[PDB]
Amino acid sequence: HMQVQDLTGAALDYWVATAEGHEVPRADASGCTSIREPGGVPTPFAPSSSWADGGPIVERLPFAGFERDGGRGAWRAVLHRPAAGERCTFNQSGPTLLIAAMRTLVASTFGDDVPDL
Amino acid sequence: HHMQVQDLTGAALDYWVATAEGHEVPRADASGCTSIREPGGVPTPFAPSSSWADGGPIVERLPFAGFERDGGRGAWRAVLHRGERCTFNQSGPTLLIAAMRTLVASTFGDDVPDL
Amino acid sequence: HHMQVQDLTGAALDYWVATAEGHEVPRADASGCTSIREPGGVPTPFAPSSSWADGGPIVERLPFAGFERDGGRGAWRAVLHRGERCTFNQSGPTLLIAAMRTLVASTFGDDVPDL
Amino acid sequence: HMQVQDLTGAALDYWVATAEGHEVPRADASGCTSIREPGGVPTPFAPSSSWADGGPIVERLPFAGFERDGGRGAWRAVLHRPAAGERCTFNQSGPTLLIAAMRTLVASTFGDDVPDL
Numbered sequence: 001h002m003q004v005q006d007l008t009g010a011a012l013d014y015w016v017a018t019a020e021g022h023e024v025p026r027a028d029a030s031g032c033t034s035i036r037e038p039g040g041v042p043t044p045f046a047p048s049s050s051w052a053d054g055g056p057i058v059e060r061l062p063f064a065g066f067e068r069d070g071g072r073g074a075w076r077a078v079l080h081r082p083a084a085g086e087r088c089t090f091n092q093s094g095p096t097l098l099i100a101a102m103r104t105l106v107a108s109t110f111g112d113d114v115p116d117l
Numbered sequence: 118h119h120m121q122v123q124d125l126t127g128a129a130l131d132y133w134v135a136t137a138e139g140h141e142v143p144r145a146d147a148s149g150c151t152s153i154r155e156p157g158g159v160p161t162p163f164a165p166s167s168s169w170a171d172g173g174p175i176v177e178r179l180p181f182a183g184f185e186r187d188g189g190r191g192a193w194r195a196v197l198h199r200g201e202r203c204t205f206n207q208s209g210p211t212l213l214i215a216a217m218r219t220l221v222a223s224t225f226g227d228d229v230p231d232l
Numbered sequence: 233h234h235m236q237v238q239d240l241t242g243a244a245l246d247y248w249v250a251t252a253e254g255h256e257v258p259r260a261d262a263s264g265c266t267s268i269r270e271p272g273g274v275p276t277p278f279a280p281s282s283s284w285a286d287g288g289p290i291v292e293r294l295p296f297a298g299f300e301r302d303g304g305r306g307a308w309r310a311v312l313h314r315g316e317r318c319t320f321n322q323s324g325p326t327l328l329i330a331a332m333r334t335l336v337a338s339t340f341g342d343d344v345p346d347l
Numbered sequence: 348h349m350q351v352q353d354l355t356g357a358a359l360d361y362w363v364a365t366a367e368g369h370e371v372p373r374a375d376a377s378g379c380t381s382i383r384e385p386g387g388v389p390t391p392f393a394p395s396s397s398w399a400d401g402g403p404i405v406e407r408l409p410f411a412g413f414e415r416d417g418g419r420g421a422w423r424a425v426l427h428r429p430a431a432g433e434r435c436t437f438n439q440s441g442p443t444l445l446i447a448a449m450r451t452l453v454a455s456t457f458g459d460d461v462p463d464l
Contacts, residue, residue, distance in 0.1 A: 004200070051288030059326060062304025071295025071313030080304035085123075085222045087196075088203040096292055107200040173398030177443055180418025189409025189427035198418030211406060238432075311434075315351070315454040318435040337432045 001113040004106050005092055008099065011117050012048045016057075016102050019109040027117050047102055054098040061105060064089065066097050075100040079108055119228040122221050123207055126214065129232050130166045134175075134217050137224040145232050165217055172213040179220060184212050195219040234343040237336050238322055241329065244347050245281045249290075249332050252339040260347050280332055287328040294335060299327050310334040348460040351453050352439055355446065358464050359395045363404075363449050366456040374464050394449055401445040408452060411436065413444050422447040426455055 007015060013032030017025035022034035024042065034045045047054035062080040074093050077100035081088040090108040094100035106114065125133060131150030135143035140152035142160065151160045165172035180198035195215035197205040205223040209215035221229070240248060246265030250258035255267035257275065266275045280287035295313035310330035312320040320338040324330035336344070354362060360379030364372035369381035371389065381392045394401035409427040421440050424447035428435040437455040441447035453461065 051284035055284030055288060055328075064301055064304040066299045068297050070317070071297040084227055085205055085207055085219075086203065087206055088201060090200055091202055092200055104200070112200055169398035169402030173402060182415050182418040184413045186411055189411040202417070213402075315437055315439055315451070315459055316435060317438055318433065320432055321434055322432055334432075342431055 002116045004103055004110065004112055004114055007103055007106060007114070009048065010046075012099070012102050012106065013046050014117065015106040015110065015114055016047050017045050019106055020057075048098050049096075051098070054102065057105070058097075058101050063101060063104075066100065068097075077101045077104040079104045081108070118231065120231045121228055122218055122225065123227070125218055125221060125229070127166065128164075130214070130217055130221065131164050132232060133221040133225065133229055134165050135163050137221055138175075166213050167211075169213070172217065175220070176212075176216050181216060181219075184215065186212075197223055199223070233346065235346045236343055237333055237340065238342070240333055240336060240344070242281065243279075245329070245332055245336065246279050247347060248336040248340065248344055249280050250278050252336055253290075281328050282326075284328070287332065290335070291327075291331050296331060296334075299330065301327075312338055314338070349463045351450055351457065351459055351461055354450055354453060354461070356395065357393075359446070359449050359453065360393050361464065362453040362457065362461055363394050364392050366453055367404075395445050396443075398445070401449065404452070405444075405448050410448060410451075413447065415444075424448045424451040426451045428455070 010027040010032045014025045014027040017032060017034040022036050025032060025034040032045050033042045035042055045053055047057055063077065064080045065078040067076045074095060075097045076091065076093045079090040090104050092100055092103035092107050094103055128145040128150045132143045132145040135150060135152040140154050143150065143152040150163050152163045153160055163171055165175055181195065182198040182204060183196040185194045192208050192210060193212045193215040194206065194208045197219045205219050207215055207219040207222050209218055243260040243265045247258045247260040250265060250267040255269050258265065258267040265278050267278045268275055278286055280290055296310065297313040297319060298311040300309045307323050307325060308327045308330040309321065309323045312334045320334050322330055322334040322337050324333055357374040357379045361372045361374040364379060364381040369383050372379060372381040379392050380389045382389055392400055394404055410424065411427045412425040414423045421442060422444045423438065423440045426437040437451050439447055439450035439454050441450055
């Protein structure tokens with residue numbers, strides 16, 4: 001198995017697609033591909049690296065924060081998840097905001113590990 | 118009839134903390150809360166919501182994960198720990214009040230019988 | 233007469249960012265902001281406050297230290313870095329708007345001439 | 348010189364006393380002593396370890412936060428310090444809340460270093 005915190009690239013993209021409920025996700029060395037629509041066509045999907053793909057997900061999902069000490073180095077992502085006094089979040093880090101965010105998304109669905117591709 | 122834990126203050130708050138902490142014969146006179154914190158102990162004052170000496174060690178010992186105060190002024194918010202992170206959260210005019218209310222909520226929930 | 237940077241939006245916000253970034257002949261038609269981002273370049277659309285492709289890299293490249301959204305809903309607050317820690321802070325309905333307003337404030341201050 | 352982040356014990360107490368404007372602060376191996384009042388008597392002062400001494404300082408000074416990941420390990424302290432869009436804080440860590448707080452206080456006054464006692 002692979003630790004979700006270490007996920008990167010096509011594999012990370014694949015787990016996000018799967019979490020998002022996309023069709024026939026694949027993770028070639030060339031990159032992840034999926035169908036994001038009713039009866040759509042297979043198209044590249046790189047939310048962990050393409051801002052166009054990842055950005056909307058960040059805005060849409062209940063992300064509560066991103067932090068980077070001194071504006072450099074690693075990012076930490078916080079994704080929100082019902083009692084009055086309670087709170088639960090999912091928390092992952094990564095070298096870029098998109099990587100941190102997508103790892104958090106994957107962890108919120110599959111937990112700490114995911115089968116290796 | 119019942120009391121909201123978030124509104125707890127003074128001796129009553131100290132009492133619920135004693136109880137949550139497993140102290141013996143807690144009580145809550147207007148004079149203040151008293152309990153026995155030891156196997157063979159005498160009843161002694163216990164004011165974790167106002168006495169730093171009593172409340173401080175509890176803050177350090179229990180899994181409190183944070184305290185926050187906007188701009189360093191006004192109300193405190195307390196966060197008590199339980200890739201997932203789940204917490205109990207309560208506020209108060211001081212750090213000790215926020216902390217103890219959070220402790221009491223983590224054990225009894227939102228309300229407690231009135232004293 | 234002048235415009236508050238915190239209220240900046242759309243093409244105007246994109247324009248101030250282009251300017252702060254040192255782009256050439258920035259302009260702000262209703263159609264949108266355009267500029268030259270290269271030594272020998274052509275005028276091309278530039279919408280960092282709405283286009284992720286344009287705004288995203290700026291967020292990653294500039295010393296942004298945080299983005300926050302209460303409960304993962306509503307307005308974003310952006311924090312841009314400058315034992316001491318000093319920051320520029322601005323809000324907006326989306327992460328890109330918050331980020332760019334913060335960028336523009338860090339360079340021009342609170343107001344800017346109206347376009 | 349000594350890094351403020353490494354300050355501990357009587358020495359840390361001494362720098363706090365000094366920052367606070369106490370009289371004849373001292374830092375014996377026995378512990379820090381000072382006069383905190385107009386013409387007062389020299390008395391023990393241990394804000395980095397005694398809650399009775401440190402607690403009130405935390406409440407009085409503009410501390411904005413204390414953080415401890417998962418409720419265990421090291422504490423981080425944030426002390427507030429005037430443009431509309433700007434913000435400055437002092438930030439130090441320590442094994443306990445009082446140590447983190449007092450190091451932050453000392454840093455807010457003397458910076459990163461302080462002469463060794």
